[PDB]
Amino acid sequence: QKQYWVCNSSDASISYTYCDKMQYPISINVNPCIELKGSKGLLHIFYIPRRDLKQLYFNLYITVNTMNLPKRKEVICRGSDDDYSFCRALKGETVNTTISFSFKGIKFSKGKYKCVVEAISGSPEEMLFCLEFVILHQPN
């Protein structure tokens, strides 16, 4: 399994690898890197799906230092009139998008943080890919 780095910050060391059999590439960038303290920034994505980016959503399996959390389910785009333009893509169509984010108001602690990322989309709802995120953390 090859390791894919993303960015470093004062208290973050994001990276990720692949879960499943198929390993279709993807390009993710974040500027500036997330400070796991309340951050802001942009998220640039370059992708070419093998399915339709329609009714896309994420299953997140989070792990707080060898302690599982419950399972998270995030619906990115629903059906009609998405907030985003990239969820009108088709197979083979270039997605080249930018989404900004920000958060604040929570304290974390040290340890190997993990999150299994499962994207699901399409007509019969088959998976689009799995990714595995490793986020170390050590506040200053």
């Binding site: 070419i48 093998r50 009139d81 998405d82 907030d83 985003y84 333009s85 990239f86 009108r88 088709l90 197979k91 083979g92 169509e93 270039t94 998008t97 930018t98 989404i99």
Partner: protein, 601 residues
């Protein structure tokens, strides 16, 4: 290079299998051949000859540089082509020649340049034509569209179309019948000279995220004049740069069109007033807003003719004060801002959905709250805290009622459902309820589906509360921590067929409580811990029983109450899953199916 056989000799998919030619060593009668991401740098005439029958064909990212003449020739019954992502630099004239029944045609990310030199002139039965993400410079419809009927969609989004002129769309003045659900979004356009759209008709028009300022948008709205679009959709996309100003005299001039259905679909601006804005968007029989933050505004009280409203994912600071003389349906779902509720006045309303908002009701539910008196549907599920101060009063006509995962307060202090004589559905599942009054379900005479899974019981003893509910065919009771049941509890219930009773904590099965159930077919006792019985007076269940799930609970494998295990080898005709019905009590007898161990004692 094995092509996966998805449906036996019907559909094969060959994706990413590094091919260079069509796999004609494939069965002779194919349908729905997937062939994408296989490099085919060029096609030849009669390419798909060994496939005389073919319904769906996909060539996505197959990097087709040129489609030669006469290709696809020996290929009819072909309903779909997906030429997505193929950069076509030489599409030969007369291509797509022999295609008798072609309806869908997707050419996205293909390097198009205009529609007049586009070989579909001979086409018919062609309904969709999705030409998105292309390089097209002016919206001048070519003349062969005259011959081309049946065209219903024309989605040219993300194109480089800059502006429009008068005699553009000189076509469409010759169409007695024309349904064209046109969609022009993300086109950077800064001029619409007047009179261009005129005596024209559409069936949808989608312009989102294309005007860079308020003046551009204003005078281009002035450009469209007398359009008569049956459904308009404006807005923008959260994904890119957006307008930095939006107030009253924007959206003006929209007042010359003939709209019937409107939708503003996003707005990055914290709009702060709703009339003298959306002013000439009245008489539209369907209003809709999505994701637009109108946080601080007081005056929602205004008269519009709006036979359908929907406010999905909107933020506020207050519950809006709706006053609509004509509004039949509302969907205030998944909003986030203002977690309260105040009486609205919707005199003619027949549907209502306030779901997953999280708001709280102190005046609960009465005819005084929604101002109507014929509300057939109501969903307050997945909200915060609902306090019952009034049984549904003035709402005697209400066939649907959901509450699941809310927080019902004071539900035991009186007959809370006492007015609902016409009610078929009721879901009070997983509300924080403690049933301690034998008259909770009083008044529901037509209730046929009763769901309540996750509601406590006084001392964990099922009382006789299911009386006068004689139409109940479906009864849900699971995670109700029941340790005992009244021996006469499910009486007067002659129509119950499904009866869920699992995930409680029982320790004795018996058949007397179910001596008289003529219509029962399923009876679930799964996640209990049921070890023995009263005594082997356990009798045959009613004939109707066709299913008795007894799986997943503990058992006691010693000589005594081997008569109980004999009475569970009584029926092989009504058991369900003998695989997970096993032994628990001794250590030596572990994981053993019960009917399996033959012991004398």
């Amino acid at each position: 290079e094995p092509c996966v056989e998805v449906v036996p000799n019907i559909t094969y998919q060959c994706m990413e299998l590094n091919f260079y030619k069509i796999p004609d060593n494939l069965p002779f009668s194919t349908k729905n051949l997937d062939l994408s991401f296989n490099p085919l740098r060029h096609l030849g005439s009669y390419s798909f000859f060994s496939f005389p029958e073919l319904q769906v064909l996909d060539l996505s990212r197959c990097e087709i540089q040129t489609i030669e003449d006469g290709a696809y020739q020996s290929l009819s019954h072909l309903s779909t082509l997906i030429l997505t992502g193929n950069p076509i630099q030489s599409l030969a004239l007369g291509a797509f020649s022999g295609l008798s029944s072609l309806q869908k045609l997707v050419a996205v990310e293909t390097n198009l340049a205009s529609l007049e030199n586009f070989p579909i002139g001979h086409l018919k039965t062609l309904k969709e034509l999705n030409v998105a993400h292309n390089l097209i410079q002016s919206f001048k419809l070519p003349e062969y569209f005259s011959n081309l009927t049946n065209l219903e969609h024309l989605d040219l989004s993300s194109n480089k179309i800059q502006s429009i002129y008068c005699t553009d769309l000189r076509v469409l003045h010759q169409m007695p019948l024309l349904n064209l659900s046109l969609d022009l979004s993300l086109n950077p356009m800064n001029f619409i000279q007047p009179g261009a759209f005129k005596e024209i008709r559409l069936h949808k028009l989608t312009l989102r995220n294309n005007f860079d300022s308020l003046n551009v948008m204003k005078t281009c709205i002035q450009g469209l004049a007398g359009l008569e679009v049956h459904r308009l959709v404006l807005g923008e996309f959260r994904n890119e740069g957006n307008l930095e100003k939006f107030d009253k005299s924007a959206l003006e001039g929209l007042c010359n069109l003939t709209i019937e259905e409107f939708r503003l679909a996003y707005l990055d601006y914290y709009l702060d007033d709703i009339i003298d804005l959306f002013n000439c968007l009245t008489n539209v029989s369907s209003f809709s807003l999505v994701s637009v933050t109108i946080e601080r505004v007081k005056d929602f009280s205004y008269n519009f003719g709006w036979q359908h409203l929907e406010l999905v994912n909107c933020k506020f600071g207050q519950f809006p004060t709706l006053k609509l003389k004509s509004l039949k349906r509302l969907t205030f779902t998944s909003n986030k801002g203002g977690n309260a509720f105040s009486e609205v006045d919707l005199p003619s309303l027949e549907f209502l959905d306030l779901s997953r908002n999280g708001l709280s009701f102190k005046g609960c539910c009465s005819q005084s709250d929604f101002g109507t008196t014929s509300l057939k549907y109501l969903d307050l599920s997945f909200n915060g805290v609902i306090t019952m101060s009034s049984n549904f009063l003035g709402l005697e006509q209400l066939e649907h009622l959901d509450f699941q995962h809310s927080n019902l307060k004071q539900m035991s202090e009186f007959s809370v459902f006492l007015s609902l004589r016409n009610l078929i559905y009721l879901d009070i599942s997983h509300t924080h309820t403690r049933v301690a009054f034998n008259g909770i379900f009083n008044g529901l005479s037509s209730l046929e589906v009763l769901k309540m899974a996750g509601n406590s019981f006084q001392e964990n003893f099922l009382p006789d509360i299911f009386t006068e509910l004689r139409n109940l065919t479906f009864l849900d009771l699971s995670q109700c921590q029941l340790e005992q049941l009244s021996p006469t509890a499910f009486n007067s219930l002659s129509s119950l067929q499904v009866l869920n009773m699992s995930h409680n904590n029982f320790f004795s099965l018996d058949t007397f409580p179910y001596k008289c159930l003529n219509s029962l077919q399923v009876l679930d006792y799964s996640l209990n811990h049921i070890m023995t019985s009263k005594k082997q007076e356990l009798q045959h269940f009613p004939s109707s029983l066709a299913f008795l799930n007894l799986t997943q609970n503990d058992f006691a494998c010693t000589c005594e109450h081997q008569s109980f295990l004999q009475w569970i080898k009584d029926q092989r005709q009504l058991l369900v899953e003998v695989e997970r019905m096993e032994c628990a009590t001794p250590s030596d007898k572990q994981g053993m199916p019960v009917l399996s161990l033959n012991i004398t004692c």
